[PDB]
Amino acid sequence: EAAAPAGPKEFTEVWNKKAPSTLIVPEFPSNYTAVKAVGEGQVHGDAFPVNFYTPHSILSQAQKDTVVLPGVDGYFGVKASHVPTIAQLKPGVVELHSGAESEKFFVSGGFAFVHPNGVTDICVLEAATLDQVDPAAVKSALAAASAAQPTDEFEQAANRAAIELYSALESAVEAKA
Amino acid sequence: SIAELGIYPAVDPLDSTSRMLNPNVIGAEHYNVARGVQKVLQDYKNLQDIIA
Amino acid sequence: ILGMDELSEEDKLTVARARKIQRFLSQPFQVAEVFTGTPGKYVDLADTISGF
Amino acid sequence: ATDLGGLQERITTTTKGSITSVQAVYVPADDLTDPAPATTFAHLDATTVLSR
Amino acid sequence: EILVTGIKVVDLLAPYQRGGKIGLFGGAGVGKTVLIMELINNVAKAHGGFSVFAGVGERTREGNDLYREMIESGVIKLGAERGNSKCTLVYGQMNEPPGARARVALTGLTVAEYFRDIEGQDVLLFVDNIFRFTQANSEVSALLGRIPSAVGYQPTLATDLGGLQERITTTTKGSITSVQAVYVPADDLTDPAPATTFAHLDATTVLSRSIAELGIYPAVDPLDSTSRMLNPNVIGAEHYNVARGVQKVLQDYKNLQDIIAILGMDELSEEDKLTVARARKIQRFLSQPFQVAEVFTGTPGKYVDLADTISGFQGVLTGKYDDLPEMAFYMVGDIKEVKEKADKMAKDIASRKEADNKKVSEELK
Amino acid sequence: SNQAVKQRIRAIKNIGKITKAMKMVAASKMKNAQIAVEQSRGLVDPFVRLFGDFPAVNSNKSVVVAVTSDKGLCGGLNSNITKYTRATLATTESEGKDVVVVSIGDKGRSQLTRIESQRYQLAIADTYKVRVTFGQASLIVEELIKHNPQSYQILFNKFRSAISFKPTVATILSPDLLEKQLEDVTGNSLDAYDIEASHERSDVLRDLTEFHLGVTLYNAMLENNCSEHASRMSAMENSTKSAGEMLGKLTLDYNRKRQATITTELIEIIAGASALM
Amino acid sequence: LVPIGRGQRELIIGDRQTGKTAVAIDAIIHQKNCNEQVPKAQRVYCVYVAVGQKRSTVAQLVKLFTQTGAMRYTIMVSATASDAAPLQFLAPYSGCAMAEYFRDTGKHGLIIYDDLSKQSVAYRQMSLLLRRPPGREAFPGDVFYLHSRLLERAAKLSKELGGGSLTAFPVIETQAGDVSAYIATNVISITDGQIFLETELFYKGIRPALNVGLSVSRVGSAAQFPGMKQVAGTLKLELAQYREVAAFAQFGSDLDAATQYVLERGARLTEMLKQKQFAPI
Amino acid sequence: DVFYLHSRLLERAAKLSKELGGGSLTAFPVIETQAGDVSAYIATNVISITDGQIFLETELFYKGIRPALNVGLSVSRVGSAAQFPGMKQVAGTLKLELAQYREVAAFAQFGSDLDAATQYVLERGARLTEMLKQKQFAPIPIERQTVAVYAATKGFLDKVRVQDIVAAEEAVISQVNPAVFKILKANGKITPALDAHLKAELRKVKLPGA
Amino acid sequence: VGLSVSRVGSAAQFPGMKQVAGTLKLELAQYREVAAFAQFGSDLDAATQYVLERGARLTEMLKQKQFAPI
Ligand SMILES: Nc1ncnc2c1ncn2[C@@H]1O[C@H](COP(=O)(O)OP(=O)(O)OP(=O)(O)O)[C@@H](O)[C@H]1O
Numbered sequence A: 001e002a003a004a005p006a007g008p009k010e011f012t013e014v015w016n017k018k019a020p021s022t023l024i025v026p027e028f029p030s031n032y033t034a035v036k037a038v039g040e041g042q043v044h045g046d047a048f049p050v051n052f053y054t055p056h057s058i059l060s061q062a063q064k065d066t067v068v069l070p071g072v073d074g075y076f077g078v079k080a081s082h083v084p085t086i087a088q089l090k091p092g093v094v095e096l097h098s099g100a101e102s103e104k105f106f107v108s109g110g111f112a113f114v115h116p117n118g119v120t121d122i123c124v125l126e127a128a129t130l131d132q133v134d135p136a137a138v139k140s141a142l143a144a145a146s147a148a149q150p151t152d153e154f155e156q157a158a159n160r161a162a163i164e165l166y167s168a169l170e171s172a173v174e175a176k177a
Numbered sequence B: 001s002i003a004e005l006g007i008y009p010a011v012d013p014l015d016s017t018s019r020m021l022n023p024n025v026i027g028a029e030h031y032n033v034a035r036g037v038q039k040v041l042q043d044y045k046n047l048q049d050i051i052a
Numbered sequence C: 001i002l003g004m005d006e007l008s009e010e011d012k013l014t015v016a017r018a019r020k021i022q023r024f025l026s027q028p029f030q031v032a033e034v035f036t037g038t039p040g041k042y043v044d045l046a047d048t049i050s051g052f
Numbered sequence D: 001a002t003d004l005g006g007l008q009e010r011i012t013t014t015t016k017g018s019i020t021s022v023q024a025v026y027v028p029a030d031d032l033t034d035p036a037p038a039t040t041f042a043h044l045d046a047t048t049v050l051s052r
Numbered sequence E: 001e002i003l004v005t006g007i008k009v010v011d012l013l014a015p016y017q018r019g020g021k022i023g024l025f026g027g028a029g030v031g032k033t034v035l036i037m038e039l040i041n042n043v044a045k046a047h048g049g050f051s052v053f054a055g056v057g058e059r060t061r062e063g064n065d066l067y068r069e070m071i072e073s074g075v076i077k078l079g080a081e082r083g084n085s086k087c088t089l090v091y092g093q094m095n096e097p098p099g100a101r102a103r104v105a106l107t108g109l110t111v112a113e114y115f116r117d118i119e120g121q122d123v124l125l126f127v128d129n130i131f132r133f134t135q136a137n138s139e140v141s142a143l144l145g146r147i148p149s150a151v152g153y154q155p156t157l158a159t160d161l162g163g164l165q166e167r168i169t170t171t172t173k174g175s176i177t178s179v180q181a182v183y184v185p186a187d188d189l190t191d192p193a194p195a196t197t198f199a200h201l202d203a204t205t206v207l208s209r210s211i212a213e214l215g216i217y218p219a220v221d222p223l224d225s226t227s228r229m230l231n232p233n234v235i236g237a238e239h240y241n242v243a244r245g246v247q248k249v250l251q252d253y254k255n256l257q258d259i260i261a262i263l264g265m266d267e268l269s270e271e272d273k274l275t276v277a278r279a280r281k282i283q284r285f286l287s288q289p290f291q292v293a294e295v296f297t298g299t300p301g302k303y304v305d306l307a308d309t310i311s312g313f314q315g316v317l318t319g320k321y322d323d324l325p326e327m328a329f330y331m332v333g334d335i336k337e338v339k340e341k342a343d344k345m346a347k348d349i350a351s352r353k354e355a356d357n358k359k360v361s362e363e364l365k
Numbered sequence F: 001s002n003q004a005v006k007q008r009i010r011a012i013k014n015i016g017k018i019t020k021a022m023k024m025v026a027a028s029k030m031k032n033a034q035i036a037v038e039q040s041r042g043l044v045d046p047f048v049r050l051f052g053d054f055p056a057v058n059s060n061k062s063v064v065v066a067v068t069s070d071k072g073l074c075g076g077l078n079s080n081i082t083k084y085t086r087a088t089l090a091t092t093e094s095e096g097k098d099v100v101v102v103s104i105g106d107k108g109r110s111q112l113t114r115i116e117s118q119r120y121q122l123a124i125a126d127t128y129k130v131r132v133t134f135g136q137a138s139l140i141v142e143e144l145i146k147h148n149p150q151s152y153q154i155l156f157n158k159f160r161s162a163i164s165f166k167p168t169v170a171t172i173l174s175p176d177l178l179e180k181q182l183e184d185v186t187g188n189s190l191d192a193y194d195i196e197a198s199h200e201r202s203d204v205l206r207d208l209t210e211f212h213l214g215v216t217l218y219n220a221m222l223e224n225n226c227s228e229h230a231s232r233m234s235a236m237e238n239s240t241k242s243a244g245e246m247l248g249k250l251t252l253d254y255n256r257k258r259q260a261t262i263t264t265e266l267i268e269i270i271a272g273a274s275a276l277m
Numbered sequence G: 001l002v003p004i005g006r007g008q009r010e011l012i013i014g015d016r017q018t019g020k021t022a023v024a025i026d027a028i029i030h031q032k033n034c035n036e037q038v039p040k041a042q043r044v045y046c047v048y049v050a051v052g053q054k055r056s057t058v059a060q061l062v063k064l065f066t067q068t069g070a071m072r073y074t075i076m077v078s079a080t081a082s083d084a085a086p087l088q089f090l091a092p093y094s095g096c097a098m099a100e101y102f103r104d105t106g107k108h109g110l111i112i113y114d115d116l117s118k119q120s121v122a123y124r125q126m127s128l129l130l131r132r133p134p135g136r137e138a139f140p141g142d143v144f145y146l147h148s149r150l151l152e153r154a155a156k157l158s159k160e161l162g163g164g165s166l167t168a169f170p171v172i173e174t175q176a177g178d179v180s181a182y183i184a185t186n187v188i189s190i191t192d193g194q195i196f197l198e199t200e201l202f203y204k205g206i207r208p209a210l211n212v213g214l215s216v217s218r219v220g221s222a223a224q225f226p227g228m229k230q231v232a233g234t235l236k237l238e239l240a241q242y243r244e245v246a247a248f249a250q251f252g253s254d255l256d257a258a259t260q261y262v263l264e265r266g267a268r269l270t271e272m273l274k275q276k277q278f279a280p281i
Numbered sequence H: 001d002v003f004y005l006h007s008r009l010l011e012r013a014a015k016l017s018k019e020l021g022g023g024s025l026t027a028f029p030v031i032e033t034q035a036g037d038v039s040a041y042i043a044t045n046v047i048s049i050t051d052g053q054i055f056l057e058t059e060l061f062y063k064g065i066r067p068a069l070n071v072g073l074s075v076s077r078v079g080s081a082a083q084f085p086g087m088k089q090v091a092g093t094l095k096l097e098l099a100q101y102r103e104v105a106a107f108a109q110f111g112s113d114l115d116a117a118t119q120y121v122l123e124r125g126a127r128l129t130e131m132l133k134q135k136q137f138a139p140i141p142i143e144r145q146t147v148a149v150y151a152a153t154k155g156f157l158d159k160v161r162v163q164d165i166v167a168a169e170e171a172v173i174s175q176v177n178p179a180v181f182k183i184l185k186a187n188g189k190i191t192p193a194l195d196a197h198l199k200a201e202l203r204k205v206k207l208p209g210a
Numbered sequence I: 001v002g003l004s005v006s007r008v009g010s011a012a013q014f015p016g017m018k019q020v021a022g023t024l025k026l027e028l029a030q031y032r033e034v035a036a037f038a039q040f041g042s043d044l045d046a047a048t049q050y051v052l053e054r055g056a057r058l059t060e061m062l063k064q065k066q067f068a069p070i
């Protein structure tokens, strides 16, 4: 079960005994990250590290005390020493509270991990916040998403993803403060 | 240099001149073609220090 | 090619000292005061060594 | 060298006074090893370059 | 018939004829006197015939050095056993007026011509700076009231040089192996005094200044030195093929010099940068420590046999030695000494010993 | 002879303008591609703390990826990771596995088939022409999972600074084919996480490994693109310097030939006049 | 590439040790090999004029021509370097007058003035000592006429005068590829063609080191063997493509598959024209 | 006869035999080149007359290295058997380490990589260069030269910062016991009894900066 | 325009031309500096492209036809 201890510690061994000596051992992405998942600490009470990520942006590196994430089984909330959870997110709004103030981003869907040291990693693709969405072209798109039922299952799945994204973007644009 | 490209007659287009290259003499629609040809070939000669 | 804030702060001080050296090498001339108004200034050597 | 030397060797400091000559130097073909500047520069003790 | 000199670049790329006219071209400190002394030390000691050194327009210090060095070697004996000497020196050095330097090569030629014609044997004629004959006639001919020729030389340059050089030949009655150093003015080979000398010589050895500035000594340009012995019907098939392969690698590297200069080494093809590496190997391997240079270098001199040169350069050409560094080839004898120097310089990067091995701290009395 | 030097001078004087121009161009591209790279650097971290970093795995099928440049005026960057991908293919291949080699950039297909021709199966290129996006990196990822391997190795040059580009190897494992097997530590290291997926853990790990491969491919070919721009800016500034030095030596030699020409024709005129007068 | 007719003047111009005397010697040895297979009205009698060479080189050539068998057709007029400058000046005219017997009796001649530069140097000496005023590179004024009145004697005669021919191969040595020198430009101007050999192609292994761009033959393909003409326009055209798509062949990375076929095809053709010496085909 | 102008002149600089007196004349002809062109006519004339050559570089002269000796070109095949035997054994190490410093800085100017052994000989050769600087009108005796070359090639001047070596080799000569230079001048040679002693007196040297 | 000098034209031209020609000859001084650089028009800074377009405007502005002085 644990019979192959791979890793950057041990790749150095098999590489140094088999690669030419003019090349030093190549780097690895674990050498560039400081924060691991099973290690000790990084909770300290109420506010835990939240890392909000898209491929094209970093939206939050700050410490938050609660996060409201839109999982595929409903909007759940992440408090400080929350249970470790790999949560697939559906289209919904992500609320990063710190107190009275909070940042509400509507995201497109993509996972959010909570780690055994309390590190929470929201990893979405497109996080289009609520004050930059228009409320007019959403109905113009879900009208065609409601109407079009093709013969193929592929565009069927695309239309189902379309309606589950646009319908959730409906519910979070009229009921905003 | 025109000749080892194989082009015959190896007349340099950007060195051959005539006093018959007035717009008054051969008309404007011939002179504009000749001036455009020389302009295009000179700009290609400028671009040859990149595209070679 | 990169920018003014690209380099360090000691490079900022090298830029500042050299820009006030480049202006301090300038001098109003006594012969040119007839067409520039401002009087010219004969600077001694003991003053420019100390000033720089 | 002998004509330039016979000119430039009369510009010295004697015991009675001195002549200090400021000479405008033209460099032919922008070539500092041409014999007129290369013979003239053997006599110069300072250069004052006025740049645009 | 070939004359094996022990010099790798000479024996490979421009082999000397035993009985032919040999020219060492180069100007002002490229090494055509150290080449002529290495040729004396290698050829003249293993010759059997007589030698004539005709010093035409050279340093008097060098002539005294050769005279004392030939007394130490027994080539010149003094006094009662003088007749067992093997060399005649004829010296017309550069302190002499231009009538003497213009005619001392003829005196040395006559001393060689007597041994060739009357004694009937094979001799060596080493003429240091045959250019000084041309120059001394050029100094005289300004005052003989003549119109000058090109660059400033006499009108009778080619015929004076020809009538001197056409006497230095092998005949049916004897042999003269002629090694003449030729100075080039301002490092210009198109000067008429070297360009006229080029036609009278069988083996040409052009020493260039930039190759000397690269540290490669003897600074023989391999792409400008030629021989009439470089012929597959004279030296063999594999020797001629190895020589042409070395010259092909060096020419292909010379054609890559501009883009290596302005774009960098990192933008050639793979076969191009294999050619560049093999050429940088065979440029260093053509250099050699001389036994007459061991007093001002510190390296022992390395006589290389001709078969050793052919075998080593065939090894570098086929690709047996793509693994060694470049400086393994610099100033070595042959293909064994490149491997010896490779382990000598790769034990050197591992050469770190403990405790500094003092045994000096308070040595007792 | 004395005219061809005047044309060589103008050629080298123009090369010293073209290379200075594209040095400034590569600098302008590097300063705005660094912005996208250090923003893309974030999303790779949750996967390398959730899935670890296991390069030396017992995959029986691998896909190596060498992320090279498209324009080939970079200065030893593309052959550096060619040396690294022939070093890592001589690190995992010791057990009789299948390896597929793909490359991103035209300098990869021209330098990978020289070292290895049979395992190379795909050439992605023209990537950096418009820009590099995540839909493009995910399309490349789907064409990588057209094969069914148990590991993926990405080779790229990571933009540490404008001077240093450390060649990073990045590894992704197939989900329960190798990822669930490499986590079994007297039990599992992944059982601490509570799966909140719509389906079971194998499906969420399949989706997670596809998303991880996409984000490391996007970050890999962003880091390599801007390190390409930095090595071009540094490689056209050692080029315009050498083209200024070559131009200086050419101008000095041309001036020597100019002076020697004027003296030569003057001496011939004087000789021809003294031969008459 | 540079086809040569009976009666034209083809310059062999090059640097030193590039293959000029080699092409001349091959041309003579091949006429020995051809004179056995043709009738007596088709034979070519060679004349080799050695101006300013050594006696050793000329003795070497005479030994070579006796071992091949070319001396039953060859005259050698040798004014070597020890000879007087008027002899080296008059030796091309002497050799051409000995070759004009074959032009004037309806037979065919092949005259090779090796080192015509050395004949110009001997003429310069002879005219500078006669106090005639020098000119460019201290040459006389009539150093063009010196060579034009010699090279114009090589002609293909009409059938009234016998139909004889004289083919001249003057040899001009240049200085580091400088064909802008005085005698080089004069003899380039006089002769019909030129066979320009290079010292950079010579060390690429390309032997005979013929620069296929600068080598011209102004008789054209009108004096070419048929069949060789059927392949020669193609060979010229692919070599012309191989020359021009080169200066990019250093970047062997990007396979283009249209230029690359042209490059390796021209490599086949360039390796084809290599040839060992003293064995004409 | 412009070659004969100088060869008639510079051949009178001789070392005579014992039968003529043993007297000597040492010449130093000076040639001014134009753009570093040592392939001029008069320059190549005298290069083929003189024994050695001291080539003074104009780009070394503006970088502060004075006397701006081009160590690669500067040759003297006549003084080798004519150097101080104490200097002959310590400056045989000096010119070879300056050769490697000339090989490293002529290729590694790009800032490509530090091999960390060629990087050692770059700031070793920078120390030998700064040790070979000299002020004007202040000649040094040959014994106070070959100790400063001993202090630098034997690593006693190592890890002194390169802008201290002008002040540091003045610290070496000032603090070493003046009886050291008296033994070295008289033997002409760093004897085995002296380098063990001179290594000791160099360890007791207050180098600047520590 | 870079090599042609007039050492009189300081206060020897039309004043309405002198109001404008200083700007015209300083805009062309930037265009001659950046022109042979950015022969390509692909990847350009928003300051260099502006003086390139201005220099290309002035260059076509100055050219005129023969035997019709203005
Ligand atoms: N096709 C060839 N194949 C092999 N070797 C050749 C070929 N052509 C010439 N060579 C060799 O190259 C050298 C060329 O010398 P060549 O006979 O050309 O003298 P040259 O150039 O006419 O006159 P000079 O000797 O004055 O330079 C000779 O050694 C010859 O053997």
Ligand SMILES: Nc1ncnc2c1ncn2[C@@H]1O[C@H](COP(=O)(O)OP(=O)(O)O)[C@@H](O)[C@H]1O
Pocket (backbone or CB within 6 Å): E026, E027, E028, E029, E030, E031, E032, E033, E034, E035, E217, E218, E290, E293, E297, H047, H048, H075, H076, H077
């Ligand atoms: N074979 C050689 N090996 C090493 N250094 C050499 C060699 N030949 C010359 N040198 C160097 O170049 C100088 C010139 O040598 P020399 O043969 O006297 O040249 P030349 O006679 O052409 O002036 C020598 O003093 C030495 O410093």
Ligand SMILES: [Mg+2]
Pocket (backbone or CB within 6 Å): E032, E033, E058
């Ligand atoms: Mg000498």
Ligand SMILES: [Mg+2]
Pocket (backbone or CB within 6 Å): G020, G021, G114, G115
């Ligand atoms: Mg010949």
